[PDB]
Design a protein around this ligand. Structure first.
Ligand SMILES: Nc1ncnc2c1ncn2[C@@H]1O[C@H](COP(=O)(O)OC(=O)[C@@H](N)Cc2c[nH]c3ccccc23)[C@@H](O)[C@H]1O
Lengths: 362, 440
């Protein structure tokens, strides 16, 4: 499939090797998450710096976000949230999650209230991922900007040190775009600096930030990292993941709303197959796990490394047929999604409100 | 002697350093100018005993014309597409306030407007309206020219008895100049004292700094974002002359100056109401921001702000440019002493009189290019006396020195009284003016 080792060279990032993974295990005392064991999160920037601080009792915080969608969230979207939740638990650090409602308002046909409405709704799905309410701040840009003595100030600092020419290349803007889009990159970068959240870190500016993201986003975070020293702040560290495969690449992906029945259908009739044409060729040459979306999905959601390896072998040999594989996946997805919907149902307005209230995170 | 020559050079270099600090010069440029000032003063301390004792272009940053008579304001009205203030509008304001039209209105200083009749309609129908004006902070760089908008705004507040919001654009200063946020905010708080000293009613006036208020308002940023969606980069390149090499902060700044035009940007003052009419007093060089704001308003469901535009108080050197702290010897500062005011008028105010007293007696003076006379039209409140001075100077009966002496007698008390009032502005009063809260 995709040659991720080349993307590392292309972007200039660092490969997450076994020694780093072992160091993470020693620092936390926890077994490394399966995304690390399987190369899902394979690249980074300054992770050793983060561990240097952590090992010396100098904590950091996590930062991630989400563009509020009209309840159009699929299993692929779970990846960074699942990893961020794991990072939060094993390092036991605070986390800030930005809901870019102002971004959606600027890019989509929505009123400011509708954009905000989508953000609060999406927040429920994020809360359903299990983040600890005592250490997690989920904020709406539209709301938080007007109730922070540090966020806007950081936005302006960034705005002063980034030119249109710079963002034009990185984000592909043209002078036909509204000024709101042009300066937005500063708002997405501001959360990377601790003094943007006074209610959490007060006036401290030395608390390193760690951002889990997709490798193809490295160019975007490069802007934030380059501006950091220019404004006297530490650069945020990054952890890069691979690309979540499209079902093939309403039926282009499996949504967190889909029912058990819908999940079955999606996998059996739409999930791309890496097996052979006829059962004759398959029992001989076997199936290819590098392109079979059904198996790739398993590498992300099946936690048992042993069962996953067994399924791989039998699918590559021919002993196991595509239909058998797709059923193994369905047995993994149905409960995964069912449990998410169940937890989402428990998210009360009182809960979402608390998560969204700027407050100290003991 | 040569010792005098040294003294003058230090004064000149000092005036230069002051203008640089007031303009957009970088810290390095300023530092280099200072090193010379310092070096030039060290040489004086030696060669002496003591140390040393002391076509028309109009946009938000520049006012330029080659005409000694200044900007052609009627033409500017056509170019900007605004409306001339006629006798009937003035008479209507008089009937609505029961007050004599301010002399700025009577003499065509505030000569242009946008929707003033909409404002009067609302007022006469018992509907509320609020005033909004602003200032780009700069440590004691405020000159007499700055009094035009502020004196008039205070007059409007008095005769209409309406609330007022004054924006101190410290973020604008931070984006365009070389300074820290604390410095920028500091200048906002200082200039605020100059403003308050104009006499604004503390029960109806809210003065806010962008840097500080943006982070404590449930409505300001939301309006900024709404505005930002309806203005393209191309549009601001055409209106303000921005380029692709400008920082993104400068490019979106226009939305910040537009936001105060909408009442719900101030929830602590007007709650959630979005129908409060807004009137914006300013010199016409600020119109670009609001012509843009007016086109955006209906797209986001708000009323268009009305405007009242004033002409420019000219630079001492002549009406070719406006008075500006950025230009050497161009301004008469609110911090100047009586002696300084006197010296600036006599030594720098461009004269429309003849070269010789003989020629002056024979041909008289030209009030259309004489800076001292122009200044009188702004501050000499007595119309008949203004007219008498005009006739006498024009006939040659009055000499330039007499004309300048009359102006000096007007400017000294004007500024001295301001300083007297600024001296009474305590840190508690400034903090109260800048505290968001309901306005009586
Ligand atoms: N020579 C002159 N003669 C007469 N009036 C003059 C002269 N020079 C300046 N002005 C007027 O003074 C006010 C403040 O000037 P600023 O350049 O600080 O102004 C600025 O830098 C703006 N970004 C601040 C601002 C924000 N919101 C506003 C709303 C209305 C007016 C101004 C603002 C203005 O009314 C300006 O027109």
């Amino acid at each position: 499939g995709i040659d991720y080792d080349k993307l590392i060279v292309r972007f200039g990032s660092s490969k997450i090797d076994k020694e780093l993974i072992n160091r993470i295990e020693r620092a936390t005392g926890q077994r490394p998450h399966h995304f690390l064991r399987r190369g899902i999160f394979f690249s980074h920037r300054d992770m050793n710096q983060v561990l240097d601080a952590y090992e010396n009792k100098k904590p950091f915080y996590l930062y991630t976000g989400r563009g509020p969608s009209s309840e159009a969230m699929h299993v692929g979207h779970l990846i960074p949230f699942i990893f961020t939740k794991w990072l939060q638990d094993v390092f036991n650090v605070p986390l800030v999650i930005q809901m870019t409602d102002d971004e959606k308002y600027l890019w989509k046909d929505l009123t400011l209230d509708q954009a905000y409405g989508d953000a609060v709704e999406n927040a429920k799905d994020i809360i359903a991922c299990g983040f600890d309410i005592n250490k997690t701040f989920i904020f709406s840009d539209l709301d938080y900007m007007g109730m922070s003595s540090g966020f806007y100030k950081n936005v302006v600092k960034i705005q002063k040190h980034v030119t249109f020419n710079q963002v034009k290349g990185i984000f592909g803007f043209t002078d036909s775009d509204c000024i709101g889009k042009i300066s937005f990159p500063a708002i997405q970068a501001a959360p990377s600096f601790s003094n943007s959240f006074p209610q959490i870190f007060r006036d401290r500016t030395d608390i390193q930030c760690l951002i889990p993201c997709a490798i193809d986003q490295d160019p975007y975070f490069r802007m934030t990292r380059d501006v950091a020293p220019r404004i006297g702040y530490p650069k945020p560290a990054l952890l890069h993941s691979t690309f979540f495969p499209a079902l093939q690449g309403p039926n282009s992906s499996i949504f967190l709303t889909d029912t058990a029945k819908q999940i079955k259908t999606k996998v059996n009739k739409h999930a791309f197959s890496g097996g052979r044409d006829t059962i004759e060729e398959h029992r001989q040459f076997g199936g290819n796990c590098d392109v079979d979306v059904s198996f790739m999905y398993l590498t992300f959601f099946l936690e048992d490394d042993d069962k996953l390896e067994q399924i791989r072998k039998d699918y590559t040999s021919g002993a196991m047929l595509t239909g058998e594989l797709k059923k193994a996946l369905i047995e993994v997805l149905q409960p995964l999604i069912a449990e998410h919907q169940a937890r989402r149902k428990e998210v009360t307005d009182e809960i979402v409100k608390e998560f969204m209230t700027p407050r100290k995170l003991a």
